[PDB]
Design a protein around this nucleic acid. Sequence first.
RNA 1: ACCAUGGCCCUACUCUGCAGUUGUGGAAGGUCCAGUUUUGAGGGGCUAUUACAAC
Length: 1066
Amino acid sequence: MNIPALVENQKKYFGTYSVMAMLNAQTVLDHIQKVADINLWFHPVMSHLYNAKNGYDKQPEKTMFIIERLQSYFPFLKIMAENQREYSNGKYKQNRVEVNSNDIFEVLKRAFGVLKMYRDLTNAYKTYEEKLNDGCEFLTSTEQPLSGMINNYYTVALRNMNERYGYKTEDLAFIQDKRFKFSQVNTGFFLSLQDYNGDTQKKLHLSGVGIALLICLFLDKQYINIFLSRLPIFSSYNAQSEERRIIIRSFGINSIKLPKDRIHSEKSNKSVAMDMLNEVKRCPDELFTTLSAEKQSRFRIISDDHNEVLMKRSSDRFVPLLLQYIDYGKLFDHIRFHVNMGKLRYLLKADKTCIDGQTRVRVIEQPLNGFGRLEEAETMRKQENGTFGNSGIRIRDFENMKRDDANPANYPYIVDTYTHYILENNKVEMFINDKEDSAPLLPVIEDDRYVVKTIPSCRMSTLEIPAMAFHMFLFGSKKTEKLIVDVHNRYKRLFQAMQKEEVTAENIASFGIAESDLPQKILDLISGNAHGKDVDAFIRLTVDDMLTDTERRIKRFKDDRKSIRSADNKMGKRGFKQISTGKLADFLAKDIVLFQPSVNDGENKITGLNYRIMQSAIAVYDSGDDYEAKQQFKLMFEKARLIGKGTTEPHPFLYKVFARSIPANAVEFYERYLIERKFYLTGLSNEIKKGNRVDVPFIRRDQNKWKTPAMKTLGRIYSEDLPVELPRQMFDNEIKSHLKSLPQMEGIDFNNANVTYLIAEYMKRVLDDDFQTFYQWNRNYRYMDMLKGEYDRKGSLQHCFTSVEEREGLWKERASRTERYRKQASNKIRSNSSEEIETILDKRLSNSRNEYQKSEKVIRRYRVQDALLFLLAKKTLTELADFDGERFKLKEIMPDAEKGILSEIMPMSFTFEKGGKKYTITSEGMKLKNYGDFFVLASDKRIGNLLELVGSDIVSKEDIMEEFNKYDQCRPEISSIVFNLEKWAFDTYPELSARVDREEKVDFKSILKILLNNKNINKEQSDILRKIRNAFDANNYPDKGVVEIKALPEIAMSIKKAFGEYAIMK
RNA sequence: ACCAUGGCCCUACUCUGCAGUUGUGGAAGGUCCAGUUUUGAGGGGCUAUUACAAC
Ligand SMILES: [Mg+2]
């Protein structure tokens, strides 16, 4: 088999990027090893998989971690592993429905093996390669299988293009219509991934384009673009063509995600303002989903460093941004937000026998939660001596990741975590200090074991934060804070009175809290209607609901299995069915513990580590009908005391699953579990129907839920045990009184005006502003498709893009239009039971309608949230610098704005910490829209070693960007200098040429040695050549002193020049 | 081939994340209903999701 001509003609590019591909792979493998405490197919992580089904797995938690993370960092592995399952079923005449570690291992073994081969050929002037001999083992076992896998991978990757970029059949037909001939692979197609490569046996190998594709699976998008742009793989499509962009996008769509090295930026009032403006230029994710491909394309921007960026929000950061704004601004004197500052780890037992009978370290974690301004808390968290707060306890370095560490001397320690706000369950928790300028409230640690935490004063809905921000903007943060504190103190006075039994229908109004903001139980208690929930009703209902769900799951599973055995089940298309044992094992572990009876305050039920083991054990269980492996699996549940004689709290029905025979694998186990669950619940239903009393493990009659509430008992729980739950519409009356006094707001009906409405009226009427233009763009919703009722000739339902006015009117007419929809839709089901159809449609319309309504409500919240960020950011920056900005308006903000605030030029300075050092990058003048550049530079692996060479931690942004682009241009020229050096050595010393013919591997290190021994170079020169060459392969800079360098932005250029001169030879 | 019918809760803001139990709590949050809302406003039902304690 011959090396493809594309490879031979672009050898310096294939050489460079093959090395980058292999290094990136090793990086991921190394990361996974470290985090999990475990010839790339011999890596510890890959060995683990290889051995993972050699008998009953002793480290299921590790196996499952490796399988999950490999699919995160290598997204193409989901597609290829699915193809490898289907392949094996073929080969061994099996019907395995689920992907396992053998699939993952085999895909990656082959990918790595072929990558390594091409890396070696392209990085050597002359070597012998036995592996290219036609009909050899390498070709038959590894390379030829991989070419077919890659070709099948690309079928699915092109399907993914439709989802990810909105491409239509017409857009992709120049590839999809021409890949296969009539079905063969069309090796004559210009983007064919397979070719004969002059193989006399006439078997399909990877083509040059195919080799490029394999490499690009292991590159970052930036390098995919640099690499492919050098290659003549675009037939006659030109640089600006859509076809070129489609090709390149197809080669990056599922490529490697590299683990990020942690960065910590210094925040300020200015930085927060700029983080806010860069938030509002991006598309909210809920909106992005609804937009046409053209308008989605408008958020795909080219940066200053000529890199395409998706300007889309990955999460709603409104609330954290607002908290940073308040903290860095020092705007609240008394209120402090709930922060986490790491976790305490203490070793309970070094050798704990677990429910699978394997010994493991038992480490307990407690969060270090507290209250203060993020900067002040962070200054307290890490002392100079590297201890936490005033605790004495060591904070372990972030790079040290031995979580399995069994040495008692190493414990306790605190995990190093930058102070962040705790923002879970759409809440903000806060602590109210009596005095101003209080110090951060860090938790005390007792017995090196207990973290003594503090119940928050009170908790606010994140949906209340827009009105708080708006109130802050109109009145001032101090007035805002006084109002939160006053509301809090009213609830406290109420709950104190409850505890004295001094709250009546006659005096409830005196407490100053509206009925709609009192708990129903207080309202029940003063009305004389206090009652518990009816436990028997709840049991009867729960049993019925669960029986129904059990049957739903039985059916879905039988359906999916049949679907998975079908030819029509196509990955990347919409009705694609997959059975994940991970997903099965999640269901089973939750349910097994749900049905485990509690005793002794719940101290008998499965604990955290054993839970993780049980769940993982299930996920990977697959006896080969090996008797021991079956016994081992059953034994786990015996040791958890769920089945077995002499158990006192057994699971009610799990033991039936193991009666007669042990299930052979996770899939058998899930099926049998669900059948047994169905029989248990049917029995219960039948006993309920006879009027008998039944009990289920997870309903407990002694819980307060079921009893009548008392005033005094409930008073104490509300005062002492929980945070105060702050009401919605706290700030409304004050907001409305203010706005009523403004003459521009004169013609507003304030009796039908919520705060969402009034923010928008404020922007329009007081400020002559409006929301960003992309909130007027037409949107698509399935539900509105159904209501519009428009089909193509073939008879599919059309995807409309409507305006808000259109949808207003469809919604008014939804009853009629739903009637039409159902009539047509039912016919189309029948053409492909009356009750079953009506049910199928019922669910279709409900789900769709609910999706549409929620989406529209949330986008309307994003609008006014953006108004508030814009307003606050603009206020910060107005009062900074010699900056004038009364003219700027939210309506001008756009993802690549050429006007308004984002186009303004100001000096900037970005300070951050990475790997224990602290650096600053400055600009003398920079458009606000480019502030994101700094994170891109700080994130770059080279930033550290580069700044070691500059000899300054402070550097110009423009200089570093130029340096990084010049580095990127030098890297292939390094490859060429090596090539010409090797070539000289071969021409001068025929020893080397002979060593090729005698089938020995000649490498660079060897050639340096020959050059040294014949005094073509000396040790100094040898060492430099070696070190520079290594630095470029690492995609990094060499250590200081190796070579004399110039200043930025010519460091890489100067290193390239030195290499070139040290490679001349006598 | 085309066409048609994550275990979960990360393109700097911390995935080195989240994913055991028991208790407490539904004024909040989630979810469902509909002559409800393009004004996270209101109504009705259901529900421990944030937190803390103990293990
Ligand atoms: Mg309300």
